[PDB]
Design a protein around this ligand. Structure first.
Ligand SMILES: CCCCCCCCCCCCCCCCCC(=O)OC[C@H](CO[C@@H]1O[C@H](CO[C@H]2O[C@H](CO)[C@H](O)[C@H](O)[C@H]2O)[C@H](O)[C@H](O)[C@H]1O)OC(=O)CCCCCCCCCCCCCCCCC
Ligand code: CLA
Ligand code: CLA
Ligand code: CLA
Ligand SMILES: CCCCCCCCCCCCCCCCCC(=O)OC[C@H](CO[C@@H]1O[C@H](CO)[C@H](O)[C@H](O)[C@H]1O)OC(=O)CCCCCCCCCCCCCCCCC
Ligand SMILES: CCCCCCCCCCCCCCCCCC(=O)OC[C@H](CO[C@@H]1O[C@H](CO)[C@H](O)[C@H](O)[C@H]1O)OC(=O)CCCCCCCCCCCCCCCCC
Ligand SMILES: CCCCCCCCCCCCCCCCCC(=O)OC[C@H](CO[C@@H]1O[C@H](CO)[C@H](O)[C@H](O)[C@H]1O)OC(=O)CCCCCCCCCCCCCCCCC
Ligand SMILES: CCCCCCCCCCCCCCCC(=O)OC[C@H](COP(=O)(O)OC[C@@H](O)CO)OC(=O)CCCCCCCCCCCCCCC
Ligand SMILES: CCCCCCCCCCCCCCCC(=O)OC[C@H](COP(=O)(O)OC[C@@H](O)CO)OC(=O)CCCCCCCCCCCCCCC
Ligand SMILES: CC1=C(/C=C/C(C)=C/C=C/C(C)=C/C=C/C=C(C)/C=C/C=C(C)/C=C/C2=C(C)CCCC2(C)C)C(C)(C)CCC1
Ligand SMILES: CC1=C(/C=C/C(C)=C/C=C/C(C)=C/C=C/C=C(C)/C=C/C=C(C)/C=C/C2=C(C)CCCC2(C)C)C(C)(C)CCC1
Ligand SMILES: [Cl-]
Lengths: 341, 30, 35, 32, 59, 30, 37, 31, 503, 68, 70, 64, 32, 37, 30
């Protein structure tokens, strides 16, 4: 009829790929995040902000390449190409670490476009939208570690760089400054992740193992009609199996796949809440009781009071080359030595 | 043109450029 | 009283409108071509 | 020093949702 | 609290993160979580209706 | 004081494990 | 209609009873050390 | 007929193995 | 048989009972308001607002009453320190008791609708069903919100008929409650201008009244009507949760970064002032300005207020807290009793050896001694064997200027190392670690806990919004697919996904 | 995925053109000036034997050219 | 004087869409009804109700009075 | 045939207009204009608050 | 000194028979 | 007989609910001052 | 501290009085 009708005819015409009303967001706003990450890992140095030569052009490998965060003096600016820090001078913008703020803040909309594309195909093909609500959890994770954590903590410099050997620096950064280990929200997170990795292997090694009998040869992959009104695995038999070995066992394969949906997103949301609490520097650092008892009684020495005395050894050694904008050079007497280990 | 034409070309067109760049980096006679 | 920040700023509100107009023209150039 | 409020918070967080679930379970299993 | 004092000292003496087997295992656990959430999404999103919209969807 | 709270919570978790294993509803047929 | 035509019944089976009680005690076991500090 | 897909894939595999061998050779003593 | 997590779905289609539970929720929120106000009055100590402010005590809802101008209690004491004669009706206890009376009144109002839910307003008078006219309801509510916004901005903020709001010295010394002149130029968008907050609501309420009358008059298109499912009710919930968590990040960001809405004399400082070096730079400038006149050290340093020197201390930085370190900054490490004064560390020649301040991340930062340039000249060694730069070997003395221990000098290293480890923190204050039984580790602030709650609840309302936005649109396939999903799931044969415009 | 022979004029000729362009884009050293990354003797100047330290915010365009 | 570039006094009708199936006792609830009713031919007759007497805003039988009072 | 109050007689024309919604587009394009202006307004105040857009009367000095 | 044991005893003596009576009342009024 | 022929139902009406709750709170109000001492 | 416990107990007793008066079962006929 009118406008917004032929534009709905097309964008919903079917081809090999599927561009849609939010594919019009997803395909342009992403793919430049991929190009910018590849460009920063291949061509672009980090000599000026950090002090680290981290490009393919400067001898680094696939493990040790990273699009690096800007310096601390670029406190919380958005770091546009044009504007008050680069003025459109593209070479100086790439030198000042604007590529990280390009890729992160540009793919934050890529996640939104992808979840809306996932939400739009589920309306096109008339299905229930449970595939959409699961992908909200890695969006929560991405926002929590790349977006909310550098905002309230004096710099984009204190953010995990887009790399492989830089994520490791970020992990040891939390392990030696924040003690992210003792966070109960992180306990929730590892329980969700590792239990989902459990239950995947359980279900996969159960379903095709209590399988029915349809074919002739021992290759049981060739005996499945995709247009089938029967089953392909004996629910009664697997129930009796796991009931007699393990005790409690499922009986409702609605609830089974819903539980597989529910575990890792619960883990990742309950990790995102703790990453927020760490962004505000409400860290799960030392307690009251064992510390006031160990200051009094010398020979106490729990693994707790060894982890604290080890994290101090992390934080006093790595900082003087991790963050040069502090401008501190420790003398060797100040460092935690350990009496000639 | 075609969306398939675009999705074939526009991804893999800079790829040979970057691969030639990486091979030149590797054959830098340092 | 326009600062250089506002100077280089208003070109972005130009440029985003040009990008969305290019999207709309890319829609019209093939959509009503086919139909 | 142990908390004045900690054991009260622990006992309350035990007993309140426990009783909340027991009410619903007994109401459910009453009919069937 | 003893598990982490094993892990950190193991990183100190053996550098477990810079080891290609360990990255394969990280890919294993993350892919396992991805595939569990993905399959549990794509099956629960296609349940044939047998009940109403007031009671449980598991009956 | 708090050690008794710790022990009570662990023993209660194990008790709920016990009742969940042995006093479940029977998974019944057709 | 003066009596409510939408009086409906809640339902909670034994499986959900065990899940809820196990969730509450596991949350207690985890957070109790940090609450007591 | 045409050049078959297995003979295409064999040559693609050899042209991948050669580039990966040059990657290891530039990994060992080059930068 | 309903599951436990959808038991409130029996009032999707019962609007009087919906109003009843709206009223009960409002009554519970007001009850929390009154009870927290009374508890915070009963805990609060007005004994010295110079060294023991509100935010050291962990006080939470009283620096909002003091923010909007409630500055007097029935005991006669006020906030700034003096006493005022007439408390009037509206004191702190009066505000709390008024909220308790609101709680009871809204309770009794909540009973009536669910007792009598079946009236004739909630009945479509044309055909005889139970509907409600959502764009006109929205026009009414937007009109009411515009009226209250305009009245608040015109009268109560600017002091036309109201008493005004807290507008303070930016350097945090002499804040008070004031009527505000609304500024209309470009300085109204600077958030450190309370004239911007004044001129905000004047425009905001007027535009809200205009839009509300617009929605009362006109009616929407059928295109947007089916595109947003405006006949359904739960689209309003999905939109409202979205608007609420958009508001939450704003009220968390302004609280954390500091604005005219959150004064430092009611919430303590912010963390960015520490590593920008705000109070230290201001104190050293106002010292060198007096020393350039011809004044001496002991009468130059002794002119800085304690309410200025108290913000040069890392224990009031709200980023040195802890999640399970409950309580308040008094129970953290004591009550601010005395200020000892500025300390100077002089070597065997006369050089003022400076002390490197502690950064934010470092819990136990080791003690160094810088020169005037940045070269380390002394330390407190962690290992005691082959120490070259120890204070016992160098011989660094400490001299005081200003404060309680003014005009004193120490050379003994057992005391010099103590004051070095304490002057590492900032300025030197003598506390009371005996009365409230503190433990000597730092706490957080009401600037911190507000931020924590309003980012966590924002992030949870994000997920709640995604869930209701899915469940609003997917109402027909809410409890399962139909039995007859067609063969339109093929790849390439049907050249359009289900839509029937041109196949 | 197997329908391709197409020994094509536009396809098969332009690929080594891009390959040699990417080769010369590094071997001529133009990429160093395009993206500003230093060359193996351009890290340390004689007046500055350390990693650079970007100090101030608003004059960074004037400061980085000094740091070059 | 024949003054309508906007046409705010137009006699245009109003497409009436019924209420959706908001009865969650049973499965398969539905949505509104597209081109259902005869679109409710608008009238500007003054009623007796003290709240909104004219029963529509866009009409001469309100706009004459609004213009005269203003 | 429900319950009748004087407010039940008063507020009924407010709950009368059930479904009278316009055919065609209506004020949709004007709505889109206001939405784009509101987005530009938020972009203005965001870049001012970030001080990526330096003005004359805006101090940003924590000082007034 | 206040009985920190005593406040827990007060809260327990409130909550336990209250929940005990609520279970029986909801089980009773479920059927009728 | 393997199912129990003596499964019987407890019953507690609203009058007894109010009596029990009033008894528990009156006992609390009386003894609380002596417990806190 | 204990004053809040006292006040909570008195207010709860008055609340049970209120619900007993107004939300009782109706005493019904034959
Ligand atoms: C769901 C996901 C949806 C998808 C999201 C898609 C991408 C959206 C991108 C939005 C980016 C928002 C950050 C804006 C950039 C910024 O940082 O801009 C910076 C400003 C604040 O600036 C900082 O302010 C600090 C203190 O300033 C104050 O003090 C100074 C001197 O004392 C100055 O006077 C200054 O003017 C005064 O305001 C410091 O000076 C810093 O140097 C300065 O950078 O932050 C701000 O705009 C933020 C506050 C206003 C916006 C509120 C919402 C955004 C943040 C929510 C969480 C807030 C943090 C919570 C705890 C974590
Ligand atoms: C849908 C695609 C899409 C989206 C959402 C974005 C989004 C973004 N880009 Mg981006 N970009 C895109 C495509 C896209 N890009 C493409 C295709 C390119 C390649 C040319 C780029 C290249 C690019 C660069 C190089 C940079 C960005 C940046 C940014 C960010 C800030 C932009 C800004 O401040 O402008 C704000 C723009 C608006 C508010 C839009 C204007 C709307 C107003 C109201 C005017 C109304 C319309 C106007 C009248 C025009 C209409 C025409 C009319 C005739 C009808 C933002 C996240 C910056 C960045 O990464 O930050 C670090 C940056 O430096 N982009
Ligand atoms: C503005 C807030 C708001 C409102 C009004 C609603 C309203 C509703 N939600 Mg909902 N929701 C919200 C936020 C909100 N939601 C958020 C943030 C989330 C994400 C966590 C969800 C996730 C959610 C799901 C997953 C579901 C609903 C459902 C529903 C509907 C029935 C609720 C029911 O019977 O559950 C009753 C639930 C309980 C009795 C449990 C309460 C126990 C809580 C967890 C502990 C007590 C909280 C405590 C008092 C502190 C809260 C105070 C404050 C901090 C908020 C109802 C329309 C259901 C639905 O769609 O209908 C089929 C449904 O399945 N909601
Ligand atoms: C209070 C304002 C007001 C109102 C309600 C009306 C109402 C009317 N005028 Mg009218 N008019 C007005 C002011 C007003 N006039 C003024 C100030 C002038 C002189 C410029 C005229 C000149 C005029 C002429 C020449 C004619 C009318 C006519 C009409 C009638 C039909 C047109 C219509 O739909 O208007 C409806 C009007 C509104 C709904 C008001 C909209 C106001 C907008 C939204 C204000 C926002 C922008 C603004 C600039 C700020 C109607 C009785 C016609 C007539 O009498 O024939 C029937 C006709 O020929 N008018
Ligand atoms: C179309 C396909 C697009 C696929 C995207 C490829 C992105 C990787 C680029 C590789 C690169 O550029 O580095 C290529 C670099 C280049 O080689 C480097 O060149 C330098 C020159 O001075 C030095 O010699 C280095 O030592 C040398 O390593 O080498 C590597 O990093 C390792 C080889 C890369 C292959 C390893 C596997 C890649 C990861 C696959 C992950 C798949 C699972 C994804 C899960 C999500
Ligand atoms: C395309 C259209 C463009 C239009 C552009 C212009 C838009 C203006 C439209 C008209 C707006 C009118 C409001 C103007 C108020 C200015 C506010 C202001 O300046 O604040 C500032 C003023 C000045 O006030 C004083 O200013 C001083 C400045 O130092 C101090 O701040 C004082 O404290 C302060 O009190 O505040 C006021 O006093 C405003 C009071 C006037 C309010 C009039 C009451 C209206 C009653 C309406 C009755 C309706 C009856 C019908 C309903 C019947 C119910 C069924
Ligand atoms: C009902 C269902 C069951 C609910 C019970 C569960 C308990 C709720 C959690 C209570 C934890 C606090 C008790 C710890 C003991 C303690 O020391 O503190 C007890 C402290 C009191 O502090 C103590 O008492 C003294 C004062 O008299 C001093 O202050 C002392 O410093 C201190 O010993 O009180 C509290 O902290 C209560 C705070 C509870 C509300 C704050 C909420 C925090 C904001 C985050 C909200 C969003 C979170 C999102 C995450 C999801
Ligand atoms: C032979 C000895 C080896 C086995 C001994 C150990 C058995 C472990 C039994 C687990 C009991 C958990 C019961 C779950 C509650 C329960 O009874 O579930 C019952 C549930 C029954 O499913 P249904 O099909 O009957 O549900 C039907 C629907 O209506 C509702 O789901 O079974 C499961 O889903 C299996 C999930 C087990 C998940 C176990 C994880 C628990 C981890 C441990 C938690 C405690 C920590 C311990 C630290 C102190
Ligand atoms: C254009 C009109 C817009 C009105 C917006 C009103 C929004 C709702 C405000 C309610 C809360 C009031 C804030 C506390 C107000 C407050 O605290 O007042 C305080 C005061 C009573 O307290 P006191 O006299 O003791 O003042 C304390 C000092 O004297 C002691 O130091 O009340 C008055 O004297 C006059 C109040 C007039 C309030 C008028 C509101 C009632 C009529 C509203 C009818 C409007 C209908 C409009 C239809 C278009
Ligand atoms: C920067 C920038 C931009 C963007 C641009 C673009 C768009 C780019 C793109 C780019 C691209 C497009 C990239 C790509 C890359 C990739 C590559 C280069 C690949 C590699 C690969 C390889 C080397 C292989 C591997 C493997 C496989 C998977 C197979 C087998 C074998 C192996 C395993 C080895 C702009 C101007 C807008 C703005 C500003 C900034
Ligand atoms: C009737 C009446 C009355 C009375 C009234 C009253 C007295 C009421 C009540 C009031 C009140 C007294 C209320 C209460 C409130 C409170 C609340 C409602 C609470 C809430 C809480 C919450 C919700 C929380 C949650 C959680 C936890 C537990 C902790 C942490 C945090 C969280 C969030 C997690 C009067 C006198 C007027 C007269 C007339 C009649
Ligand atoms: Cl150890």
């Amino acid at each position: 009829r009118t406008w917004f009708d032929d534009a709905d005819d097309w964008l919903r015409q079917d081809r090999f790929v599927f561009v849609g009303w939010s594919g019009l967001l997803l395909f342009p706003c992403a793919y430049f995040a991929l190009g910018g990450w590849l460009t920063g890992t291949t061509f672009v140095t980090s000599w000026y902000t950090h002090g680290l030569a981290t490009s393919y052009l400067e001898g680094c490998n696939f493990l040790t390449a990273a699009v690096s965060t800007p310096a601390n003096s670029m406190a919380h600016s958005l770091l546009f190409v044009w504007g008050p820090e680069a003025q459109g001078d593209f070479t100086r913008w790439c030198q000042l670490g604007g590529l990280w703020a390009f890729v992160a803040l540009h793919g934050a909309f890529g996640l939104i476009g992808f979840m809306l594309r996932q939400f739009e195909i589920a309306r096109s093909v008339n299905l229930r939208p449970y595939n959409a609500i699961a992908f909200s959890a890695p969006i929560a994770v991405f926002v929590s570690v790349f977006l909310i954590y550098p905002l309230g903590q004096s710099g984009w410099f204190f953010a995990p760089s887009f790399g492989v050997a830089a994520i490791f620096r970020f992990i040891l950064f939390f392990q030696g400054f924040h003690n992210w280990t003792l966070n109960p929200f992180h306990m929730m997170g590892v329980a969700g992740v590792l239990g989902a990795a459990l239950l995947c292997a359980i279900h996969g090694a159960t379903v095709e193992n209590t399988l029915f009998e349809d074919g002739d040869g021992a290759n049981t992959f060739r005996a499945f009609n995709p247009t089938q009104a029967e089953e392909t695995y004996s629910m009664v038999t697997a129930n009796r199996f796991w009931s007699q070995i393990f005790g409690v066992a499922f009986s409702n394969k609605r609830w089974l796949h819903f539980f597989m949906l529910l575990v890792p997103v619960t883990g990742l949301w309950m990790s995102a809440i703790g990453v927020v609490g760490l962004a505000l520097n409400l860290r799960a650092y030392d307690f009251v009781s064992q510390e006031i008892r160990a200051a009094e009684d010398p020979e106490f020495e729990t693994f707790y009071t060894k982890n604290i005395l080890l994290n101090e050894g992390i934080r006093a050694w790595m900082a003087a080359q991790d963050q040069p904008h502090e401008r501190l050079v420790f003398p060797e007497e100040v460092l935690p030595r350990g009496n000639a280990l | 043109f075609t969306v398939r034409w675009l999705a074939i070309h526009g991804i893999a067109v800079p790829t040979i450029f970057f691969l030639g760049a990486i091979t030149a980096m590797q054959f830098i006679q340092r | 009283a326009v600062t250089p920040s506002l100077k280089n700023f208003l070109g972005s509100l130009i440029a985003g409108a040009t990008v969305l107009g290019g999207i709309a023209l890319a829609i019209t150039a093939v959509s009503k071509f086919d139909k | 020093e142990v908390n004045i409020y900690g054991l009260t918070a622990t006992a309350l967080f035990i007993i309140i949702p426990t009783s909340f679930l027991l009410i619903l379970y007994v109401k459910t299993a009453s009919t069937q | 609290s003893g598990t982490f004092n094993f892990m950190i000292v193991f990183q100190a003496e053996h550098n477990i993160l810079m080891h290609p087997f360990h990255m394969l295992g990280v890919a294993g656990v993350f892919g396992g979580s991805l595939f569990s959430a993905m399959h549990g999404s794509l099956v629960t999103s296609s349940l044939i209706r047998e009940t109403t919209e007031n009671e449980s969807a598991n009956e | 004081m708090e050690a008794l709270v710790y022990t009570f919570l662990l023993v209660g978790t194990l008790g709920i494990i016990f009742f969940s294993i042995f006093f479940r509803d029977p998974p019944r047929m057709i | 209609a003066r009596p409510n035509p939408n009086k409906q019944v809640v339902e909670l089976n034994r499986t959900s009873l065990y899940w809820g009680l196990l969730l509450i005690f596991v949350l207690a076991v985890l957070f109790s050390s940090y609450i007591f500090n | 007929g045409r050049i078959p897909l297995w003979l295409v894939g064999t040559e693609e595999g050899t042209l991948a193995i050669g580039a990966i061998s040059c990657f290891f050779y530039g990994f060992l003593c080059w930068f | 048989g309903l599951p436990w997590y959808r038991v409130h779905t029996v009032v999707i289609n019962d609007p009087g009972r919906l109003i009843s539970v709206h009223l009960m929720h409002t009554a519970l929120v007001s009850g929390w308001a009154g009870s927290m106000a009374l508890f915070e009055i009963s805990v609060f100590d007005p004994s010295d607002p110079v060294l023991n402010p509100m935010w050291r005590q962990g006080m939470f809802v009283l620096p909002f009453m003091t923010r909007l101008g409630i500055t007097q209690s029935w005991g006669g004491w006020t906030i700034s320190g003096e006493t005022a004669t007439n408390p009037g009706i509206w004191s702190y206890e009066g505000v709390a008791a008024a909220h308790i009376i609101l709680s009871g009144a809204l309770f009794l109002a909540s009973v009536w609708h669910w007792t009598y839910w079946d009236l004739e307003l909630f009945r479509d008078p044309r055909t005889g069903k139970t509907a409600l006219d959502l764009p006109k309801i929205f026009g009414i509510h937007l009109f009411l919100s515009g009226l209250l916004c305009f009245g608040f901005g015109a009268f109560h903020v600017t002091g036309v008929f109201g008493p005004g709001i807290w507008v303070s010295d930016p350097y945090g010394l002499t804040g008070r409650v004031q009527p505000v002149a609304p500024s209309w130029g470009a300085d109204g968008f600077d958030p450190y201008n309370p004239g911007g907050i004044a001129s905000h609501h004047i425009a905001a309420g007027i535009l809200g009244v205009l839009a509300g009358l617009f929605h009362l008059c006109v009616r929407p298109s059928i295109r947007l009507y089916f595109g947003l499912s405006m006949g359904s009710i739960e689209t309003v919930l999905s939109s409202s949760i979205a608007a609420v968590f958009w508001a939450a990040f704003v009220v968390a960001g302004t609280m954390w970064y500091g604005s005219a809405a959150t004064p430092i004399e009611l919430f303590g400082p912010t963390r960015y002032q520490w590593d920008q070096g705000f109070f230290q730079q201001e104190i050293q400038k106002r010292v060198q300005a007096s020393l350039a006149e011809g004044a001496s050290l002991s009468d130059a340093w002794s002119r800085i207020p304690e309410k200025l020197a108290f913000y040069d201390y890392i224990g009031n930085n709200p980023a040195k807290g802890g999640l399970f370190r409950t309580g308040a900054m008094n129970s953290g490490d004591g009550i601010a009793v005395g200020w000892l004064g500025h300390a100077s560390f002089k070597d065997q020649e006369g050089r003022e050896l400076f002390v490197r301040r502690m950064p934010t991340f470092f819990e136990t930062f080791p003690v160094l001694l810088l020169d005037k340039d940045g070269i380390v000249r002394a330390d407190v060694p962690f290992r005691k064997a082959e120490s070259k730069y120890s204070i016992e070997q160098v011989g660094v003395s400490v001299t005081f200027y200003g404060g309680e221990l003014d005009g004193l000098t120490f050379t003994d290293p057992a005391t010099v190392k103590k004051y070095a480890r304490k002057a590492q923190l900032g300025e030197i204050f003598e506390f009371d670690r005996s009365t409230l039984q503190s433990d000597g580790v730092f706490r957080s602030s009401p600037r911190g806990w507000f931020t924590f709650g309003h980012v966590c609840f924002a992030l949870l309302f994000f997920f709640g919004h995604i869930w209701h936005g899915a469940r609003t649109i997917f109402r027909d396939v809410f409890a399962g697919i139909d039995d007859d999903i067609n063969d339109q799931v093929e790849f390439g044969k049907y050249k359009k996904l289900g839509d029937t415009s041109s196949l | 995925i197997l329908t391709s022979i197409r020994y094509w004029v536009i396809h098969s000729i332009t690929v080594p053109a891009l390959f040699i362009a990417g080769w010369l884009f590094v071997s001529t050293g133009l990429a160093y000036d395009v993206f500003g990354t230093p060359r193996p003797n351009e890290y340390f100047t004689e007046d500055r034997q350390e990693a650079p330290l970007i100090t101030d915010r608003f004059n960074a365009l004037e400061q980085v050219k000094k740091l070059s | 004087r024949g003054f309508d570039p906007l046409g705010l006094s137009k006699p245009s009708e109003f497409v009436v869409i019924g209420v959706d199936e908001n009865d969650q006792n049973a499965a398969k609830n539905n949505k509104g009804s597209v081109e259902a009713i005869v679109q409710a031919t608008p009238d500007e007759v003054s009623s007796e109700n003290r709240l909104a007497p004219y029963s529509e805003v866009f009409g001469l039988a309100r706009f004459r009075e609004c213009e005269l009072i203003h | 045939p429900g319950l009748v109050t004087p407010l039940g007689t008063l507020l009924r024309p407010l709950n009368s207009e059930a479904g009278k919604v316009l055919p065609g587009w209506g004020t949709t394009v004007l709505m889109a204009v206001f939405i784009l202006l509101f987005a530009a307004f938020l972009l203005i105040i965001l870049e001012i608050y970030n001080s990526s857009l330096i003005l004359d009367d805006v101090s940003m000095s924590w000082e007034t």
